């Protein structure tokens, strides 16, 4: 007995036959009508357990549904050599005040 | 809305860097005259 | 259950055609049917066993078959304006025991005196205004598709390389340009409803797409345009946001920035190995 | 079909450019360019070029039971690296070069009288 | 309850079944069984995790079970939904570390060149 | 058996009718068809009395010569046409016509407008739209000849739990405006008619920003290169106090 | 054999086919016969004036005269995006302005060298 | 403001007013 998730425009939601049961995380938005559950954009990472109760010959049943996302915002691309491309051109200028400050620092 | 990894935060600090710069100056050239 | 092929028919007058009905539950007999504007539904056909054929209500003009007991084929013995109409078929166990039926999915067939009438249609999409955005923060899109006979199309939408099936409506049948004529063209509407927070991104791909149903391989053409066969027909916008700021001017500003600091930074070390290089020649004059 | 069965699947969320081949078989192969650069069995049966702003090009082939396809080739130029000449451009520009000539040079004058 | 456990690190994700520590463990992806018969050289499995790399978004993402050897797959009643974008040579950062990394960097600078002043007028 | 429409409310009790006079049948059932479809077996029975489905009830009367249907809870998922047949023990299952049927919807808040849609710039047309209702309007056609008008329908978008009524009107002369083109029907009394004084607001487009992985990556490279600039700038003043300060 | 040839300039893209040596060109356009008689077919060209994104993308062939466009040789395949006053950054465009900025200023600051020695 | 032009603007007013100051205070200095 799953729970169907479905995906409308850019949005979530949590459809089942009765209420909806919070658990934990996202605690989301009741619509209009009751037995749905709006968990807002994809892209800022609904995560949850939510928890429904049957009908329809599975009536008299209950499950349990886990939510995960990772639409990957707050990422960046990065090459293991540009990393030491950084960290060296970084270092030869905090060097190059180094040398720079003893030069006026005897006068 | 969703900025990510362009919140304005991190521009108004590297300012901030300069900012400190101009209040010294200003209190050293007062501490002079 | 039962299948039947071909969906949609063009054919001129005098010219034969052999439509199909197959099944597999394991009954046995089968029928046809004529559905019109009016009349209803009035049988053609029908084959209580694996050979004897009877006739009907309407058989004027209609040949039929019985070689196994799961096909029951449909021949026209030739064309006339009368014959445009819609065929079912129909299927039963066992004479009158369990009384059961199960029909098909259809076939549509006009007949015509000339190909030099059959046009495909033409499809344009109309972008939401701005007065219901303030008002309601809702917007529609509309698309037309105009001026095609015969009457063969299916519309649907497609918003990111995917389909959709929630928020849209299509009219029922597909009205005349002029009802005062015999041989008159066809056109057909549809709508899609959207949040505004939704149109506004600028990286949001629409499309309406027409699927027509018309001419093939096998017809002489001596006219001058382009023989109008089965094909897909479609309409594209992005979504745009009016004022404001969005993500497309964002890159126009660090572009710009990166260029410049580079430059900066460029003449910055010029200068460093200019002063450099004369405190090495006083270093030099003051042995 | 006239042995053209690779094609071009576009305008995904992401800007992802994959390819589908038409073939009736399993363990397609795929090529750029004369020599193999894949091989993929089913449950997958697109192959991925990357996001379109990196804007690929090249040839590409793919074969299963019988002999190879003829090509396709691909050419994207989604410019992504385009500045736009108004009066704010050529404006900062101008006034950025006037004043660090113009300070670089005051140094230059104190250095060396 | 006990949830699972989703590790993503580069193009690879790593899932963990918590339920049943005394146990053989099976899996399956919208019914259709996964693993555990050695197709799928990039699809492995172990005790108590499945491994999945070179993962795809648009294929390969939906409901995830897991149940014992034993038992009957349609009578579970806790499922995982997972979508996830993965790319090669990609990190996932935060905002307040970005801050730590550019503070941290003016500081030391500051600390080097308290230290080679003072040194300096000591000769 | 009765054709032409009937127009229910949402939430009603829809009562159907078929008359066989005068055989002795026995076989007893009704077809759904809906539009552009084929038919579809919703209930058998050939005996007198009542074999619920859910909310389908029908009630058989053999002397008195007619069957009927009653729907309870109706909704908008219900418009079709519905056929009632019967037969012998024979072959020939013989049809009535079927009977169209709508049902209307519930309309809680009206706003009725007539929009004007940006054109498309590749065709010649312009387009009008008149929207939500309250479903007691009719819409009449066009005395012209060169304005189409279509009928009107409802949508149902589901990420917000709300539905609608809509018209749509084009031509391609000249003269042709939207405040002129819904003339030929009733109207409610204060709809609203738009200024070309626009309105944007702009901390509602605030709400849709989105981010690549190159912003990120072009962002991190602008704060590079001002601690560059830091950097050297201290330098070259070290240095020029070196040779100025003697 | 030798593939086709785009070259984009302002907003006007054309396109060459050097792949058959001598006969009459004949172009399509997903399936639709573009070219002839805005767009302007030359000898041995294609030309396409003001570009739009969402109308001109897809699969452009050309075929001899007289054929058949299921047997030419293969298909193109492009989807473009331009501009007018826009111009694009490489990384050799930006060394150049990098490296004639620097050899500009790099002169300036001698000539006030020279003017600020000779004066005291 | 999310528009990071008041940023860079806030960057050279902020950076043109060291110089002027740094001048200052060496000519009285
Ligand atoms: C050495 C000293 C004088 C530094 C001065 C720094 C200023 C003059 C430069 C650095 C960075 C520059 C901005 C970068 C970014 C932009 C965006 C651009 O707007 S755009 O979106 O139309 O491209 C207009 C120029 C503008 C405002 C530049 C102005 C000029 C600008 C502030
Ligand atoms: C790329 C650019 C914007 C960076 C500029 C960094 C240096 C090269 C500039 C910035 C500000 C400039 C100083 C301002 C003005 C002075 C005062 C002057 O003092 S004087 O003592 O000898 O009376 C010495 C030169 C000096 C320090 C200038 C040198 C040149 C100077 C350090």
């Known amino acids: 007995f799953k729970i169907p998730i479905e995906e409308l425009e850019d949005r979530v939601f949590v459809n089942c036959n009765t209420s909806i049961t919070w658990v934990e995380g996202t605690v989301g938005t009741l619509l209009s009508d009751i037995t749905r559950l709006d968990l807002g954009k994809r892209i800022l990472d609904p995560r949850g357990i939510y928890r429904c109760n049957g009908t329809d010959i599975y009536k008299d049943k209950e499950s349990t549904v886990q939510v995960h996302y990772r639409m990957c915002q707050s990422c960046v691309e990065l090459d293991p050599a540009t990393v030491a491309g950084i960290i060296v051109t970084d270092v030869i200028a905090t060097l190059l005040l180094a040398l720079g400050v003893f030069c006026f620092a005897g006068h | 809305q969703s900025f990510g990894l362009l919140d304005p935060k991190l521009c108004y600090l590297l300012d901030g860097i300069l900012f400190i710069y101009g209040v010294i100056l200003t209190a050293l050239f007062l501490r002079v005259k | 259950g039962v299948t039947q092929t071909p969906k949609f028919q063009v054919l001129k007058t005098g010219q034969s055609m052999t439509l199909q009905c197959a099944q597999d539950?394991?009954?046995?007999?089968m029928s046809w049917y004529r559905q019109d504007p009016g009349m209803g539904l009035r049988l053609i056909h029908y084959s209580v066993g694996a050979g004897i054929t009877d006739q009907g209500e309407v058989p004027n003009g209609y040949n039929v078959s019985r070689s196994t007991t799961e096909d029951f084929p449909l021949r026209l013995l030739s064309a006339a304006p009368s014959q445009t109409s819609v065929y079912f078929c129909?299927?039963?166990?066992?004479?009158?025991?369990?009384?059961?039926?199960?029909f098909g999915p259809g076939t549509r067939l006009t007949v015509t005196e000339d190909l030099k009438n059959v046009f495909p249609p033409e499809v344009a999409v109309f972008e939401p205004s701005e007065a219901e955005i303030s008002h309601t923060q809702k917007a529609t899109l509309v698309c037309l598709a105009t001026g095609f006979y015969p009457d063969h199309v299916e519309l649907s939408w497609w918003v990111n390389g995917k389909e959709v099936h929630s928020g849209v409506s299509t009219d029922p049948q597909p009205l005349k340009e002029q009802p005062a004529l015999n041989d008159s063209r066809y056109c057909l509407s549809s709508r899609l409803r959207v949040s505004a927070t939704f149109w506004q991104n600028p990286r949001n791909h629409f499309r309406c797409q027409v699927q027509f149903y018309g001419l093939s391989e096998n017809d002489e053409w001596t006219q001058d345009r382009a023989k109008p066969v089965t094909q897909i027909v479609s309409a594209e916008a992005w979504g745009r946001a009016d004022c404001g700021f969005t993500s497309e001017s964002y890159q126009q500003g660090v572009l710009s920035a990166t260029i410049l600091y580079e430059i900066l930074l460029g003449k910055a070390t010029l200068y460093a190995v200019l002063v450099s290089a004369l405190v090495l020649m006083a270093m030099v004059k003051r042995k | 079909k006239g042995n053209h069965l690779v094609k071009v699947y576009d305008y995904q969320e992401d800007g992802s450019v994959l390819l589908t081949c038409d073939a009736e078989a399993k363990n397609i192969t795929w090529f750029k360019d004369g020599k193999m650069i894949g091989f993929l069995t089913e449950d997958k049966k697109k192959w991925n070029l990357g996001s379109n702003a990196k804007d690929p090009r090249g040839m590409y082939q793919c074969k299963g039971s019988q002999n190879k396809s003829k090509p396709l080739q691909v050419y994207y130029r989604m410019c992504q690296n385009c500045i736009e000449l108004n009066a704010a451009t050529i404006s900062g520009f101008l006034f950025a070069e006037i004043v660090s000539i113009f300070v670089l040079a005051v140094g230059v004058y104190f250095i060396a009288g | 309850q006990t949830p699972y456990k989703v590790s993503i690190s580069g193009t690879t994700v790593i899932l963990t079944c918590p339920q049943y520590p005394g146990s053989e463990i099976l899996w399956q992806h919208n019914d259709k069984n996964i693993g555990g018969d050695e197709d799928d050289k990039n699809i492995g499995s172990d005790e108590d995790h499945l491994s999945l790399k070179e993962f795809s978004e648009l294929e390969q993402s939906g409901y995830y079970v897991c149940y014992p050897r034993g038992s009957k797959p349609e009578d579970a009643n806790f499922y995982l939904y997972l979508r996830a974008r993965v790319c090669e040579n990609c990190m996932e950062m935060d905002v307040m570390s970005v801050a730590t990394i550019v503070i941290v960097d003016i500081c030391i600078t500051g600390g080097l060149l308290l230290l080679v002043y003072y040194w300096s007028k000591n000769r | 058996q009765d054709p032409g429409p009937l127009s229910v409310p949402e939430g009603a009790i829809v009562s159907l009718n078929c008359t066989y006079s005068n055989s002795a049948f026995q076989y007893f059932m009704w077809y759904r068809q809906y539009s552009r479809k084929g038919p579809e077996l919703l209930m058998y029975?050939?005996?007198?009395g009542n074999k619920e489905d859910g909310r389908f009830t029908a009630q058989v009367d053999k002397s008195s010569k007619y069957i009927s249907l009653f729907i309870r809870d109706s909704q908008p998922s219900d418009s079709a046409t519905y056929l009632c047949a019967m037969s012998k023990g024979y072959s020939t299952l013989t049809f009535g016509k079927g009977t169209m049927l709508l049902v209307s919807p519930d309309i809680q808040n009206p706003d009725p407008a007539v929009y004007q849609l940006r054109d498309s710039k590749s065709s010649d047309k312009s387009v009008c739209l008149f929207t939500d209702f309250d479903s007691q309007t009719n819409v009449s056609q066009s005395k012209d000849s060169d304005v189409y008008i279509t009928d009107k329908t409802v949508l149902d978008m589901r990420s917000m739990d709300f539905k609608s009524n809509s018209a749509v009107a084009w031509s391609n002369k000249s003269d042709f405006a939207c405040a002129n083109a819904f003339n030929n029907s009733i109207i409610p009394e204060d709809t609203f008619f738009p200024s070309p004084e626009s309105s944007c607001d702009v901390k509602l487009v605030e709400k849709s920003f989105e981010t690549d992985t190159n912003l990120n990556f072009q962002n991190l490279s602008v704060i590079g290169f001002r601690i560059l600039l830091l950097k050297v700038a201290g330098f070259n003043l070290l240095m020029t106090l070196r040779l100025w300060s003697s | 054999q030798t593939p086709y040839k785009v070259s984009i300039s302002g907003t006007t893209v054309i396109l060459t086919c050097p792949q058959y040596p001598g006969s009459e060109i004949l172009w399509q356009h997903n399936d639709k016969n573009i070219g002839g008689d805005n767009i302007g077919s030359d000898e041995d060209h294609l030309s396409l004036k003001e570009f739009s994104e969402l109308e001109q993308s897809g699969y452009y062939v050309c075929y001899p005269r007289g054929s058949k466009p299921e047997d030419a040789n293969f298909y193109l395949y492009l989807r473009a995006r331009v501009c007018e006053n826009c111009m694009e950054m490489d990384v050799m465009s930006v060394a150049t302005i990098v490296i004639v900025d620097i050899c500009i200023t790099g002169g300036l600051l001698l000539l006030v060298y020279y003017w600020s020695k000779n004066r005291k | 403001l999310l528009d990071p032009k008041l940023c860079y603007l806030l960057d050279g007013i902020l950076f043109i007013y060291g110089v002027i100051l740094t001048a200052l205070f060496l000519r009285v200095k």
């Open positions: 029975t050939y005996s007198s």
């Open positions: 539950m394991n009954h046995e007999y």
């Open positions: 129909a299927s039963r166990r066992r004479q009158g025991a369990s009384g059961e039926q199960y």
